[PDB]
Design a protein around this ligand. Structure first.
Ligand SMILES: CCCCCCCCCCCCCCCC(=O)O
Length: 119
């Protein structure tokens, strides 16, 4: 039971409203959610197909998303991800505070901050 579970419906709502025929931001982001310092759930934010889906726990790549296809990955506490998703903080602020680990293209998360704020 994650705080993040409480906000998934609202995020799916916002994804459903994105226009499908004029696509410009199509990154694949892996998100590894922590509770008490260990990864307890992993999800993919798939901006190509515009979906969020659960993946195998803590994995680096999958058959559908091989390594060369993943743009960036973030390890983040469940509570902090819920705060970003509810627009109470940003990825930029969490990076400034040392609260997250990001591999791959860090700029993808900073750009996501900017796109999400208008949605
Ligand atoms: C911070 C968590 C975000 C999770 C997903 C939020 C749902 C909408 C996010 C913004 C959608 C970006 C739209 C890009 C459209 C495009 O130009 O291709």
């Amino acid at each position: 039971a994650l705080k993040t579970d409480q906000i998934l419906d609202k995020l799916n709502e916002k994804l459903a409203q994105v226009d499908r025929s004029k696509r410009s931001f199509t990154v694949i982001l892996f998100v590894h959610l922590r509770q008490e310092g260990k990864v307890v759930r992993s999800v993919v934010l798939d901006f190509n197909d515009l979906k969020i889906s659960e993946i195998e726990l803590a994995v680096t790549s999958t058959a559908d998303y091989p390594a060369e296809r993943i743009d960036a990955s973030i390890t983040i506490d469940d509570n902090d991800f819920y705060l970003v998703a509810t627009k109470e903080t940003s990825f930029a602020a969490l990076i400034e505070q040392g609260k997250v680990d990001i591999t791959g293209n860090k700029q993808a998360f900073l750009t996501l901050d900017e796109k999400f704020r208008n949605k």
